[PDB]
Ligand binder design. Sequence first.
Ligand SMILES: Cc1ccc2c(C[C@H](N)C(=O)O)c[nH]c2c1
Ligand SMILES: CC(C)=CCSP(=O)(O)OP(=O)(O)O
Length: 344
Amino acid sequence: GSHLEPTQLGGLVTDQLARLCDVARLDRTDTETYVQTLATSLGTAAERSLALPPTTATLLSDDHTPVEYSLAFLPGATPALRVLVEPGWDSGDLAENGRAGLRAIRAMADRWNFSTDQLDLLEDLFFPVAPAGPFALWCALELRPGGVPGVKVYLNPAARGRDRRAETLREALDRLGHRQAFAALPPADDYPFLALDLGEWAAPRVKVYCTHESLSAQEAGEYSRRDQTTDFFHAVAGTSTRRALTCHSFTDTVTGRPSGFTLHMPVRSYVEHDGRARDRAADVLRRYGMDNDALDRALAAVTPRPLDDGVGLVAYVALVHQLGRDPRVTVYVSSEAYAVQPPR
Ligand SMILES: Cc1ccc2c(C[C@H](N)C(=O)O)c[nH]c2c1
Ligand SMILES: CC(C)=CCSP(=O)(O)OP(=O)(O)O
């Protein structure tokens, strides 16, 4: 059973997650495992009344809910479900938020038998005494059949100050052995996140994110190593330049070449309401042979509201390229535990 009430933050988000697990076709056992895992990862936030303000005005979501969902669509397959959480959100300041986030990762490492050595190598870079914002630690869980999730940790290159973003990222990559990865990154306006895969890997796997304030479709296609990336840009943007995020995945330390590239488009910034955002995402999924029906079921799993009564439920749509795999489209879906942003 559940110790949580629908008037508590953890009750709302576990209800959403359980419904999403059904869309992802997870059985009852894995569903129970992952719903409890989400509640545990939130710590004391799970029991917090939704009538109180969000404890932390987090960047994780627009209304400051410390949870966001995503669905990864491959051609002809049921989408894979992931959840992003801020384990330290119910803390009083950024330093304690980071401490609690690391405690949560360590608990997961013990439970599922993986090492935090590669994350431990970086602690002084990402968890200084008086950290700068905008966040300290997020955790993404891939909710895999079987009940053992994939774990990724998201870290803040600005933790030692905005002026040290590149210094922190470059030193982190060097410590991980990725001494040629920084040279492969495109010009950028920010390095908002560094993500580390945690699990059964003898060498670090890292994802570097770059913000582009004024990306064009042509530049997006250039950065992708093309034609599918430019078409995706236009399909999601509704189009000369747009704000977007790229990420660059490095899975070997030898070449300095990325093995993956993702273009993330904040569709919530381009449309009047979520009906329009759903329409663009649905058309992209359908054109690539993906499970567009499952997208509609996922939105209904999260909230019963009419899509045109707000914007931001569909937060981002991304096109993921990875050597050796078919392209995937990821749709990011907000929890809206605290507020619905009004239509434009
Ligand atoms: C592809 C993507 C990019 C950024 C984010 C954030 C941080 C914040 N909400 C933002 O939009 O910058 C949460 N989930 C994301 C997913
Ligand atoms: C930027 C944030 C918070 C999340 C991006 S989604 P992700 O990194 O989990 O996507 P993949 O690991 O590439 O499947």
